Amino acid sequence: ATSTVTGGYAQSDAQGQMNKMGGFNLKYRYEEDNSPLGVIGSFTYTEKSRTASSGDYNKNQYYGITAGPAYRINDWASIYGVVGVGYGKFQTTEYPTYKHDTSDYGFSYGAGLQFNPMENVALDFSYEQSRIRSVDVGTWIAGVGYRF
């Protein structure tokens, strides 16, 4: 069988919210010997950056799990599409009790292309968009991997 390892970096911007985040992703790929199917699973970890001025500090973390099939044609290039779910958590203040979700969640999807399918180095570039109740987030992901 064949295995491919890829890693990448992404930056996200929140339209309608004021904040920017940075995260990293690790990808695992599995292929079948007699009937290959392209599958990628990626785990993303992003953190919010802090700026010195007001003096207030807030801890915000976001984790996302995604998976996507991939199609190869004319042995030239391969394309894939992914969907996943992400959750975000922030420091809590003591508020009166009411029915509501403890953490925020949203859905993400996108597609990517593979370039330079020669040697042990290949590049992956994809566009990511996600909706987190009424807030729009855009993330660009690029990374490099090797197959053996």
Question: Are 140 and 10 in contact, with CB atoms under 8 Å apart?
Answer: yes
Tokens for 51, please give them: 């700026």
* Residue closest to 4 by CA, chosen among 33, 28, 34: 28
**Domains of the chain: total:** 1
Tokens for 40, please give them: 């990628």
Solved how? Answer: NMR
Q: In the chain, helix, strand, coil percent, each to 5? A: 0, 65, 35
- Judged by phi (left if over 0) then psi (alpha if -120 to 50, else beta), residue 74 lies in left
The sign of the dihedral angle between the CA atoms of 124, 41, 25, 15 is: positive
The DSSP H or E segment spanning 102 is: none
Question: Are 28 and 41 in contact, with CB atoms under 8 Å apart?
Answer: yes
What distance in Å separates the CA atoms of residue 113 and residue 132, rounded to the nearest whole number? 25
**Residue 112: what residue type?**
G
Show the domain range for 43. 1-148
Question: Are 120 and 94 in contact, with CB atoms under 8 Å apart?
Answer: no
Q: What is the CATH classification number for the domain harbouring 131?
A: 2.40.160.20
Q: How many Cβ atoms are within 10 Å of 40's Cβ, its own excluded?
A: 21
